[PDB]
Design an enzyme around this catalytic site. Sequence first.
Site, PDB file in Angstrom:
ATOM      1  N   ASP A 190      -0.465  -7.961  29.786  1.00  0.00           N
ATOM      2  CA  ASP A 190       0.402  -6.928  30.605  1.00  0.00           C
ATOM      3  C   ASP A 190       0.419  -6.858  31.935  1.00  0.00           C
ATOM      4  O   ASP A 190      -0.789  -7.167  32.484  1.00  0.00           O
ATOM      5  CB  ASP A 190       0.140  -5.642  29.879  1.00  0.00           C
ATOM      6  CG  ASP A 190       0.780  -4.336  30.624  1.00  0.00           C
ATOM      7  OD1 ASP A 190       1.870  -4.158  30.330  1.00  0.00           O
ATOM      8  OD2 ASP A 190       0.061  -3.481  31.348  1.00  0.00           O
ATOM      9  N   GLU A 216       3.616 -10.956  31.155  1.00  0.00           N
ATOM     10  CA  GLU A 216       4.736 -10.109  31.471  1.00  0.00           C
ATOM     11  C   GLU A 216       4.680  -9.888  33.095  1.00  0.00           C
ATOM     12  O   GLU A 216       4.067  -9.117  33.546  1.00  0.00           O
ATOM     13  CB  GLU A 216       4.588  -9.053  31.157  1.00  0.00           C
ATOM     14  CG  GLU A 216       5.806  -8.019  31.291  1.00  0.00           C
ATOM     15  CD  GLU A 216       5.645  -6.522  31.846  1.00  0.00           C
ATOM     16  OE1 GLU A 216       4.400  -6.412  32.114  1.00  0.00           O
ATOM     17  OE2 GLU A 216       6.431  -5.911  31.681  1.00  0.00           O
TER      18      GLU A 216
HETATM   19  C1  7SA Z   1       6.978  -0.516  32.937  1.00  0.00           C
HETATM   20  C2  7SA Z   1       7.030  -1.850  33.712  1.00  0.00           C
HETATM   21  O1  7SA Z   1       7.214  -1.434  35.229  1.00  0.00           O
HETATM   22  C3  7SA Z   1       7.264  -2.480  36.248  1.00  0.00           C
HETATM   23  O2  7SA Z   1       8.415  -3.018  36.183  1.00  0.00           O
HETATM   24  C4  7SA Z   1       9.444  -2.598  36.928  1.00  0.00           C
HETATM   25  C5  7SA Z   1      10.036  -3.724  37.697  1.00  0.00           C
HETATM   26  O3  7SA Z   1       8.997  -4.143  38.498  1.00  0.00           O
HETATM   27  C6  7SA Z   1      11.431  -3.116  38.779  1.00  0.00           C
HETATM   28  O4  7SA Z   1      11.750  -4.240  39.471  1.00  0.00           O
HETATM   29  C7  7SA Z   1      12.168  -2.422  37.755  1.00  0.00           C
HETATM   30  O5  7SA Z   1      13.248  -3.317  37.137  1.00  0.00           O
HETATM   31  C8  7SA Z   1      14.334  -3.304  36.845  1.00  0.00           C
HETATM   32  C9  7SA Z   1      14.724  -1.967  36.182  1.00  0.00           C
HETATM   33  O6  7SA Z   1      14.056  -1.371  34.981  1.00  0.00           O
HETATM   34  C10 7SA Z   1      16.117  -1.726  36.143  1.00  0.00           C
HETATM   35  O7  7SA Z   1      16.690  -0.465  35.707  1.00  0.00           O
HETATM   36  C11 7SA Z   1      16.989  -2.323  37.545  1.00  0.00           C
HETATM   37  O8  7SA Z   1      18.240  -1.976  37.545  1.00  0.00           O
HETATM   38  O9  7SA Z   1      16.616  -3.592  37.907  1.00  0.00           O
HETATM   39  C12 7SA Z   1      15.180  -3.679  38.044  1.00  0.00           C
HETATM   40  C13 7SA Z   1      15.014  -5.297  38.524  1.00  0.00           C
HETATM   41  O10 7SA Z   1      15.376  -5.689  39.609  1.00  0.00           O
HETATM   42  O11 7SA Z   1      11.762  -1.498  37.064  1.00  0.00           O
HETATM   43  C14 7SA Z   1      10.774  -2.095  36.229  1.00  0.00           C
HETATM   44  C15 7SA Z   1      10.288  -0.760  35.363  1.00  0.00           C
HETATM   45  O12 7SA Z   1       9.851   0.334  36.039  1.00  0.00           O
HETATM   46  C16 7SA Z   1       5.998  -3.707  36.105  1.00  0.00           C
HETATM   47  O13 7SA Z   1       6.259  -4.606  36.959  1.00  0.00           O
HETATM   48  C17 7SA Z   1       5.948  -4.045  34.661  1.00  0.00           C
HETATM   49  O14 7SA Z   1       4.982  -4.547  34.108  1.00  0.00           O
HETATM   50  C18 7SA Z   1       5.965  -2.787  33.540  1.00  0.00           C
HETATM   51  N1  7SA Z   1       5.812  -3.183  32.193  1.00  0.00           N
HETATM   52  C19 7SA Z   1       4.214  -3.378  31.390  1.00  0.00           C
HETATM   53  C20 7SA Z   1       3.277  -2.218  32.414  1.00  0.00           C
HETATM   54  C21 7SA Z   1       2.860  -0.844  31.769  1.00  0.00           C
HETATM   55  C22 7SA Z   1       1.786  -0.444  32.363  1.00  0.00           C
HETATM   56  O15 7SA Z   1       0.536  -0.774  31.615  1.00  0.00           O
HETATM   57  C23 7SA Z   1       3.592  -0.338  30.679  1.00  0.00           C
HETATM   58  O16 7SA Z   1       3.941   1.171  31.160  1.00  0.00           O
HETATM   59  C24 7SA Z   1       4.138   1.980  30.206  1.00  0.00           C
HETATM   60  O17 7SA Z   1       2.905   2.705  30.121  1.00  0.00           O
HETATM   61  C25 7SA Z   1       2.511   3.563  31.179  1.00  0.00           C
HETATM   62  C26 7SA Z   1       1.047   4.006  30.769  1.00  0.00           C
HETATM   63  O18 7SA Z   1       0.869   4.783  29.558  1.00  0.00           O
HETATM   64  C27 7SA Z   1       3.407   4.487  31.293  1.00  0.00           C
HETATM   65  O19 7SA Z   1       2.964   5.366  32.465  1.00  0.00           O
HETATM   66  C28 7SA Z   1       2.737   6.790  32.497  1.00  0.00           C
HETATM   67  O20 7SA Z   1       1.438   7.030  32.257  1.00  0.00           O
HETATM   68  C29 7SA Z   1       0.723   6.818  33.537  1.00  0.00           C
HETATM   69  C30 7SA Z   1      -0.849   6.899  33.230  1.00  0.00           C
HETATM   70  C31 7SA Z   1       1.190   7.502  34.500  1.00  0.00           C
HETATM   71  N2  7SA Z   1       0.480   7.214  35.791  1.00  0.00           N
HETATM   72  C32 7SA Z   1      -0.593   7.926  36.344  1.00  0.00           C
HETATM   73  C33 7SA Z   1      -1.664   7.115  36.693  1.00  0.00           C
HETATM   74  C34 7SA Z   1      -2.013   6.732  38.147  1.00  0.00           C
HETATM   75  C35 7SA Z   1      -3.231   5.567  38.179  1.00  0.00           C
HETATM   76  O21 7SA Z   1      -4.490   6.444  38.653  1.00  0.00           O
HETATM   77  C36 7SA Z   1      -1.770   7.562  39.135  1.00  0.00           C
HETATM   78  O22 7SA Z   1      -1.527   6.722  40.335  1.00  0.00           O
HETATM   79  C37 7SA Z   1      -0.247   8.095  38.886  1.00  0.00           C
HETATM   80  O23 7SA Z   1       0.226   9.046  39.655  1.00  0.00           O
HETATM   81  C38 7SA Z   1      -0.406   8.883  37.514  1.00  0.00           C
HETATM   82  O24 7SA Z   1       1.303   9.617  37.087  1.00  0.00           O
HETATM   83  C39 7SA Z   1       2.686   7.284  34.868  1.00  0.00           C
HETATM   84  O25 7SA Z   1       3.096   8.083  35.786  1.00  0.00           O
HETATM   85  C40 7SA Z   1       3.495   7.561  33.413  1.00  0.00           C
HETATM   86  O26 7SA Z   1       4.973   7.192  33.558  1.00  0.00           O
HETATM   87  C41 7SA Z   1       4.773   3.866  31.697  1.00  0.00           C
HETATM   88  O27 7SA Z   1       5.740   4.704  32.041  1.00  0.00           O
HETATM   89  C42 7SA Z   1       5.206   3.088  30.628  1.00  0.00           C
HETATM   90  O28 7SA Z   1       6.353   2.270  31.160  1.00  0.00           O
HETATM   91  C43 7SA Z   1       4.555  -1.126  30.151  1.00  0.00           C
HETATM   92  O29 7SA Z   1       4.933  -0.495  28.918  1.00  0.00           O
HETATM   93  C44 7SA Z   1       4.259  -2.617  29.837  1.00  0.00           C
HETATM   94  O30 7SA Z   1       5.249  -3.467  29.333  1.00  0.00           O
END
Ligand code: 7SA
Length: 415
Positions: A190, A216
């Site tokens: 990941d 990924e």
């Molecule tokens: C979800 C993906 O995001 C990123 O990809 C980006 C890509 O770089 C960008 O170009 C863009 O790509 C596309 C876009 O999708 C499209 O619409 C657009 O038209 O075109 C773009 C390309 O140009 O967007 C992608 C998705 O956001 C990454 O590069 C990719 O690796 C990741 N996929 C993997 C990674 C994770 C994390 O392990 C997983 O996320 C998942 O698990 C995470 C952890 O539970 C989830 O995070 C949640 O929980 C966290 C603890 C929380 N964070 C806390 C933690 C902290 C830290 O102490 C604090 O700083 C924060 O303030 C606090 O809130 C998040 O806010 C919350 O959303 C995340 O939402 C979910 O997707 C995915 O399932 C896995 O497959």
Amino acid sequence: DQAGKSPAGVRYHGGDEIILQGFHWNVVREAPNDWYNILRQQASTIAADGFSAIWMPVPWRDFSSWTKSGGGEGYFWHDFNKNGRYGSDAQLRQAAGALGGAGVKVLYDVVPNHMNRGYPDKEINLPAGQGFWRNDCADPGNYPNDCDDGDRFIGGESDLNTGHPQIYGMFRDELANLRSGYGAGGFRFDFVRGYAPERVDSWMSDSADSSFCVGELWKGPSEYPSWDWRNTASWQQIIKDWSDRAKCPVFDFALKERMQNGSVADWKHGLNGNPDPRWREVAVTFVDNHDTGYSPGQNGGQHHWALQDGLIRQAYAYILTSPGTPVVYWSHMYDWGYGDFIRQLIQVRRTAGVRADSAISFHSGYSGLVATVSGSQQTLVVALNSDLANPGQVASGSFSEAVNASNGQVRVWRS
Ligand SMILES: C[C@H]1O[C@H](O[C@H]2[C@H](O)[C@@H](O)[C@@H](O[C@H]3[C@H](O)[C@@H](O)[C@H](O)O[C@@H]3CO)O[C@@H]2CO)[C@H](O)[C@@H](O)[C@@H]1N[C@H]1C=C(CO)[C@@H](O[C@H]2O[C@H](CO)[C@@H](O[C@H]3O[C@H](C)[C@@H](N[C@H]4C=C(CO)[C@@H](O)[C@H](O)[C@H]4O)[C@H](O)[C@H]3O)[C@H](O)[C@H]2O)[C@H](O)[C@H]1O
Ligand SMILES: [Ca+2]
Ligand SMILES: [Ca+2]
């Protein structure tokens, strides 16, 4: 199934894998504490459908929760204990045993970049001030710092220093654990932008050298600094460079970006279409995953970048007939009714002997995408959203129809 690394040492396990993504985003909510039981019960079906491998959810327990809402899916795990929201340790062992017994290798999603540092009841408690965490060092932005040689997850306060020897070893030992009692045949890494690609090579060399892996890397050129060569590079070049350094296959986000933004004709510009076999054979192709696609259940899942339903059959026909290693998304296969179509395409792929390095040639003069694919046993002609009339317009030999769906928008013929 054949094993083996590529000519360049890349861990594509013979190039002949056909992978099922074995979950969707909302599994922990839709089937509470029961997913491993479901996978055990479905193992013989998954094998009969023609899959050689299954990408399992992160096995490390995750009791996180946020508000859209989510949590618990594995990507914010708090320790390696297997008693999480997919089922118990015993149920995981039963599922992995059933899948392996049926000939389906078990690939675990692993999340080295970060952990749920703030969770109050956990087995892994790493203090500050010893270099274990990214934010033990100055953190001026989302890029490498002195405690983290990759990007950070959101604010970075939970990013681990994976290069610290203690942390490196912690993950090395857990990968070995997964390969032992949990029957792992490989791993899906990941957020590989978050730590050095060479560290993935090292982890695999130490704990699973002959296994399959996939990284990924989902990061477009504009996300790199203007002075980085990747800022002006193609999506293909970015993911290929990661694969070179990790010696691991890489998800074909170049193909996905073309499927979302380009025309069907432009799908030839994924990594899996590259004329150099050392490029295309490291691509791991897909239509959607738990991030990009919908899922059953709350909010329709995440649907960050979902392929519209008028292209799903075309996209599966493309990935299942072409080079690279294809991955089928759980919900297309088992929720939304594409299973029979996908089963048929898997059989076409196997009967023709298509592998990750098979040659693919694209033909001009027609609408849509027209390709010839050289399997070890048969040549395929594939015509997607095309005005091609018949395979003899574009290929020598005797052909018969193998697939004809969506009023001819998906046609495949075989020699
Ligand atoms: C979800 C993906 O995001 C990123 O990809 C980006 C890509 O770089 C960008 O170009 C863009 O790509 C596309 C876009 O999708 C499209 O619409 C657009 O038209 O075109 C773009 C390309 O140009 O967007 C992608 C998705 O956001 C990454 O590069 C990719 O690796 C990741 N996929 C993997 C990674 C994770 C994390 O392990 C997983 O996320 C998942 O698990 C995470 C952890 O539970 C989830 O995070 C949640 O929980 C966290 C603890 C929380 N964070 C806390 C933690 C902290 C830290 O102490 C604090 O700083 C924060 O303030 C606090 O809130 C998040 O806010 C919350 O959303 C995340 O939402 C979910 O997707 C995915 O399932 C896995 O497959
Ligand atoms: Ca193999
Ligand atoms: Ca990081």
